[PDB]
Structure 1
Amino acid sequence: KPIEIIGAPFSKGQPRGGVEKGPAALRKAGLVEKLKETEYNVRDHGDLAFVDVPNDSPFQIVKNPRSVGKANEQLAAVVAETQKNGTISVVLGGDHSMAIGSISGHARVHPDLCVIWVDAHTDINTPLTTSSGNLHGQPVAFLLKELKGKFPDVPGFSWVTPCISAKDIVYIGLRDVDPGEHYIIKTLGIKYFSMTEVDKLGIGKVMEETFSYLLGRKKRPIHLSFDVDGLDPVFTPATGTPVVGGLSYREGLYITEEIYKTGLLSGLDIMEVNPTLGKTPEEVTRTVNTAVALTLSCFGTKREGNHKPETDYL
């Protein structure tokens, strides 16, 4: 199977500068080389160059709408391309707002795909409900069909086409949801596993249920959008929005290991890694490393170990 790394050094989805250095950090840690050591063919597409939209006036409360909408239109193009020729796309974030382009592009080639969203936040604020005009917290709002026309069109997002419905997404790791967002998920019947369900069920049963919910009827492509803040700040401290009480390093890998086993992984997002937010070099190293680990886990690396077929080690 082919793998194609796509860097998206973008950061207008939110106020904190740094996330755009995410892809560099993950590469510097040997992500690409370590991936080659797996049974997958790897091709690094490089980092996309995003053209800055001059005079990008805020839309009501939404900030940098055009720059974000354009950077995402570009990314969607690229992702659709690699997806078209049957390769698995792996996007390296900047901020999670790039998930708009990532998933959009993916859905063009695979319209029946489902989304597993490992986050601490639902990122489903609509331009009307956001308290801050930060777009990294509104990705899903622009993707859901059920949210079509429930908020004014935003400058630069006209190209977007709601590709997935409320029945095709499942949240895992939730613990910091705004009143508005909570209203939305309850109202639309979205499936989720907040930290309370994780604590209650254990990470084993949670994964078991997310699959029977999304793959029960039809087996379809899987798009994993992983926000590094879904793990507890103790594991991934170098991010913009820390939230105590999150998934452990162990649980994170267990999610990625189970997803690898389904053989349906089609698209991946490793978002919000911000190298400039580490209080100590070690905090940044901790974060990058676990991000990398999760990525390799998605593509086979098992904790029980791995050995190359047909090779008699004795």
Structure 2
Amino acid sequence: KNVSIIGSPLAAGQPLGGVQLACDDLRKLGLHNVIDVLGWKYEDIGNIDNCYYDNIRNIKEIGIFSKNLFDTMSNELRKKNFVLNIGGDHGVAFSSILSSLQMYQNLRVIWIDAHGDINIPETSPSGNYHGMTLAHTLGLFKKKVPYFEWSENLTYLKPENTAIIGIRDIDAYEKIILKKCNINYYTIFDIEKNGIYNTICTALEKIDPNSNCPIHISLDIDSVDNVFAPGTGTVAKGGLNYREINLLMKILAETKRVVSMDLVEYNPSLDEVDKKVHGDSLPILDNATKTGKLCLELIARVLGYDIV
């Protein structure tokens, strides 16, 4: 029950700023107090500081930041702590997942997102890296990436060892990549048909039939519906509801196999207040904005927070 906290305030994978503020906001809202009350101990590492594709925006900053995160996270993973990586946009999952993967070669990844993040630079509508991070992590890139030379000899994640859950906003070319690479995916319609519980059980059975693999959770908060998670940059209608995302995190916690996690795309500047109701009983700041509070509650779920 030791968690290393790593702030990864990278905001270069997409146009906007705001997400760079996520890590410190969550600390302000009571991250340490929440971890404490759940009976975990933490080590807060602070914040990460900061032939070829030529069409990836801000790639220099991203590559240099990612090397730093890769190195820092590798060191925390070696302590056999649970490692919590707080973004930042989703670009931070490349180094997060690959560092975890080098240590846990049988790692299984649950990517929770409204989006596929599985564009390659030649299919991307935007040139924004956060929309390509999963493709990059999966080894789907066809050319070298400037400032990622340090990463070229790493082992990459395999599609069959991954499940994407909650998706509903996929680009035209992206749809083809999704089917082609054989990744396991569960759309919001699958969730509507079968319920979130059956969906995650199905996903886990698919990628870890023997229930014996370490799990990395990469949670993009925009997987959650706008009603509950307004504080994020790229919204898509029809998301996971409050009950669903909480149940999903609880089920993943109960595997007892989660070794690392990203929580990405929280943008405090975009967030709103309810606010404070009696049920906000974790040691979270009164009247905290609702997405920040949800982030902390979802982190609590992964650390074993339960209704009874």
Q: TM-score, length-normalised on structure 1?
A: 0.90
Aligned counterpart, 2:290: 286
Aligned counterpart, 1:43: 43
Aligned counterpart, 1:82: 76
Aligned counterpart, 2:299: 295
How many residue pairs get aligned? The number is 293
Aligned counterpart, 1:125: 119
* 1:39 to partner: Cα distance: 2.9
> Can you give the 5+ residue segments of structure 1 that lack an aligned partner in the other structure?
51-57, 306-314
Structure 2 CA distance for partners of 1:162 and 1:122, relative to 1, 3 Å: farther
SS in structure 1 of the partner of residue 20 of structure 2:
helix
* 1:59 to partner: Cα distance: 5.2
Q: Once the two structures are superposed, what CA deviation does each residue of 1:241-286 show, in whole Å capped at 9, x if it has no partner?
A: 01110000110011110011100010011100001123x4559701
Aligned counterpart, 1:183: 176
For residue 171 of structure 1, the aligned residue among 157, 164, 178 is 164
8 Å CA contact 1:124–1:137 kept in 2: the answer is: yes
CA distance in 1, matches of 2:253, 2:135: 27
Aligned counterpart, 1:114: 108
Q: Once the two structures are superposed, what CA deviation does each residue of 1:33-53 show, in whole Å capped at 9, x if it has no partner?
A: 111111322111111212xxx
The reply on whether 1:159 has 2:146 as its aligned counterpart is no
* 1:152 to partner: Cα distance: 1.6
CA distance in 1, matches of 2:88, 2:138: 22
User: What is the one-letter code of the residue matched to 1:78?
Assistant: T
Worse-matched range after superposition: 206-215 or 119-128:
206-215
Aligned counterpart, 2:269: 276
Identical-residue share of aligned pairs (%): 32
CA distance in 2, matches of 1:111, 1:88: 16
8 Å CA contact 1:78–1:105 kept in 2: the answer is: no
8 Å CA contact 2:221–2:232 kept in 1: the answer is: yes
CA distance in 2, matches of 1:32, 1:209: 33
Q: Once the two structures are superposed, what CA deviation does each residue of 1:157-194 show, in whole Å capped at 9, x if it has no partner?
A: 12223521111100111000011111011112211110
Counterparts of 1:59-98 in structure 2, within 5 Å, are 60-98=54-92
The reply on whether 1:256 has 2:249 as its aligned counterpart is yes
Aligned counterpart, 2:232: 239
For residue 197 of structure 2, the aligned residue among 197, 204, 208 is 204
CA distance in 1, matches of 2:137, 2:116: 13
> Can you give the 5+ residue segments of structure 2 that lack an aligned partner in the other structure?
276-287
* 1:151 to partner: Cα distance: 2.0
Worse-matched range after superposition: 206-215 or 256-265:
206-215
CA distance in 2, matches of 1:34, 1:217: 32
The reply on whether 1:2 has 2:2 as its aligned counterpart is yes
Aligned counterpart, 2:29: 29
8 Å CA contact 2:53–2:144 kept in 1: the answer is: no
User: What is the one-letter code of the residue matched to 2:264?
Assistant: M
8 Å CA contact 2:228–2:291 kept in 1: the answer is: yes
CA distance in 2, matches of 1:83, 1:60: 33
Q: TM-score, length-normalised on structure 2?
A: 0.92
CA distance in 1, matches of 2:105, 2:211: 13
User: What is the one-letter code of the residue matched to 2:223?
Assistant: G
CA distance in 1, matches of 2:99, 2:59: 19
Aligned counterpart, 1:308: none
